[PDB]
A and B are shown apart, each in its own frame.
Chain A
Amino acid sequence: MSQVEPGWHFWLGYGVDTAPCNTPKEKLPIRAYPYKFQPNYTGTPGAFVTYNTLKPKISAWEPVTKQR
């Protein structure tokens, strides 16, 4: 499972009468970018890894000496 396309995955679990090959294009969500379809890669080295999106809270001070 989860090797199927989303707009089908709805219909496989019987969300819609009309499979996405027969839907009108008005119900197509218009997108301004291409699509990639990563199914799932659990255990595979393509597994998702996490990290905090933001930097540390307090930046340090860079050492800048001053010859007196």
Chain B
Amino acid sequence: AEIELTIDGHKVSIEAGSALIQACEKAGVTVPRYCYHDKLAIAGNCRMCLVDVERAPKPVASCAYPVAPGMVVRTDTERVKQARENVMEMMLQNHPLDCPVCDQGGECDLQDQSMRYGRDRGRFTEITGKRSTEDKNIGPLVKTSMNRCIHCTRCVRFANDIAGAPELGSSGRGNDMQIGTYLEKNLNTELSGNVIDLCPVGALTNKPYAFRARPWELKKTESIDVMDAVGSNIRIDSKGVEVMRVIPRVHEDVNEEWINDKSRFACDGLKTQRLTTPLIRVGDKFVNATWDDALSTIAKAYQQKAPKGDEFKAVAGALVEVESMVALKDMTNALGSENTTTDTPNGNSAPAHGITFRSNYLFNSSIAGIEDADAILLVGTNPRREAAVMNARIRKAWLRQELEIASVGPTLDATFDVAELGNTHADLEKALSGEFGEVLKNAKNPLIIVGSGITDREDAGAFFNTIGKFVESTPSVLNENWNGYNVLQRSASRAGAYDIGFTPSDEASKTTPKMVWLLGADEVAASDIPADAFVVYQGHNGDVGAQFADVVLPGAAYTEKAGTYVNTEGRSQISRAATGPPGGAREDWKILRAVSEYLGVALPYEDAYEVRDRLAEISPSLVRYDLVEPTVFGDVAVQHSLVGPNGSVTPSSAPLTETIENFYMTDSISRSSPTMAKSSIAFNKDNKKNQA
């Protein structure tokens, strides 16, 4: 079923029917290109992958020539070496003289490409000159100078097929061809900024990071995205103090070399509103103070209030470290109170399902299994919003194979074709027994997918009890080699927190605390906090969580520390620190160590490796990094998820409203960054953001 051929003497075998350029990549003979891409449709617009083929009258493009057996591929024919210089020279007679103002200085693929294979001179010295192109306003996210564009089609095929915003397009013939809406209307898909990593010239580039640095100055650091349930494998570009930008480093499973929009532009809030020193409340006024004085005030007011048990509330947030929450849980339960609750509304109890049986809070199919998916249904979520990388996988599957999606709850605009069913758990229960009890029994590799917003609803448990019956009832959705129950989170950390055992007891859910511990956790209200409560915030920037506080503690953000994160898939991933904590911020668990020391609590560690062993004690799957194991406990896990909230939850007719208010305003950084404020204003039902 495979084909062996010869590229430059190198024999190489590749699967039949594939493209020749992948065979050149497999053989190790580097062939330059401009408009081939792996994850995209193939168009031969670039003319760069010209290559000599025995039994061919003319040299042909290697991107779209299909693999045939008995093939002799030559790349160094003098005709081909002529041809590459030719095509480069043809490309470089309307591209404008913008190399010192173009953003991709060292990263111009065209440019490095034109050093190997370019001509010495360029005989453009015509009088009346090149063409020139309109400014083409698009949005506040994507800087646009269409003069530098070469119509390499790589933007528009992506936003067409995978991003699913078909507003981009090619309009006009010859040099009157342009790219984009000639309405001059606003583009938005929920992964909008992914085109500026994709246009190989600086036609489309980064608007907030417009000219601030330049890719030879940069220090690069491979790390993990947060404020996203997938925890995409990213790269931090940093000058050394600030954080310049983020670019998705390639990874096969988790992101297929794509990244969320909010994940992209989040570096603005990472440098503008940060906590740089500890501030103690005077009474309607904070003053900054000695780093001893803050923690000594913590110990002093602990001796004043004395929470002896079930009065030390400890709440963590959305982008918080697993390694920090270990220190948190250790401190609280050596303190003698498991008032250990999430930030979410209806987080003050257990989240209506098992903290046991990791399957209860994880994504049990593979994300790679979504290529093999058949017919699924969302409940109570917008997966276009929550984990837009997942939506990219959904649309790629739906275009590739033949699928069926249902959507129960909020009416969303997908890129793909949804099928709505209702806005009631009774409408849901009607739909399960209506027609898809037959379909999901029929389907080979389906799944069923649940957003985390239903955890907000107090009627979650019966909301589980229906669906927990159905997985139990249908053996097709619950077989050995995968499990159809699949849940997501809004964070990169509440999955890791549910690995920690970050849940209050039924007893701990009752008492109003006296000493509230904020660790991130922006979305608390004045209702969630007691009146006289000791409310020491530990975070990185200034949000609502820092506004209620008594003492704030500058902790490092996700960039500055050696983080450890768990996605909804369950991948334990290292976040390599790109820079040091700025000002007077420190790392979080190191702060909790000293906070223990000014109490009677003795944490048994002082290093990072001893934390790694303590973390191995909580779960050894979190020191064994980034390797996804399945669960051998499917049926017992679903049954134990059924038995707990069985019956006692009485589901009301509350409509399944939207989980989040806006996408680009959450998680204390989209509110910190001014670029997401101006992103938020431009993105609701505007005449440039409307369709018709």
Contact = CB atoms under 8 A, between A and B. Distances in A.
Interface of A: 57-68
B285 A57 contact: no
Interface string B257-301: 000000000000001111111010100111100000000000000
Given A57-B271, A57-B582, A67-B284, A62 B542 contact: yes
Task: For chain B, give the interface size range.
Answer: 20 to 34
A66 B582 contact: no
Interface string B508-550: 0000000000000000001001010000000001101011100
B242 A68 contact: no
Nearest to A65: B284
Contacts of A68: 526, 529, 531, 548
Contacts of A63: 279, 285-287
A8 B544 CA distance: 65
Contacts of A67: 284
Interface SS of A by simple majority: loop
Given A59-B271, A61-B276, 11 more contacts: A57-B242, A57-B271, A57-B582, A58-B582, A58-B583, A61-B546, A63-B279, A64-B542, A65-B285, A66-B526, A68-B531
B271 A65 contact: no
A45 to B, nearest CB: 34
Residue of A61, A62, A64, A66 with most chain B CB atoms under a 10 A cut-off: A61
A59 B273 contact: yes
Nearest to A64: B547
Nearest to A60: B276
B242 A58 contact: yes
Given A58-B276, A58-B583, A66 B544 contact: yes
Contacts of A65: 281, 284-286, 547
A60 B526 CA distance: 25
Contacts of A59: 271-274
Nearest to B532: A68
The 6 closest A-B pairs by CB, nearest first: A61-B542, A63-B286, A66-B547, A68-B526, A57-B241, A60-B276
B241 A61 contact: no
Contacts of A64: 542, 547
17 contacts: A57-B241, A57-B271, A58-B241, A59-B272, A60-B274, A60-B276, A60-B277, A60-B583, A61-B275, A61-B541, A63-B279, A65-B281, A65-B284, A65-B547, A66-B526, A67-B284, A68-B529
**Most chain B CB atoms below 10 A, which of A60, A62, A67:** A60
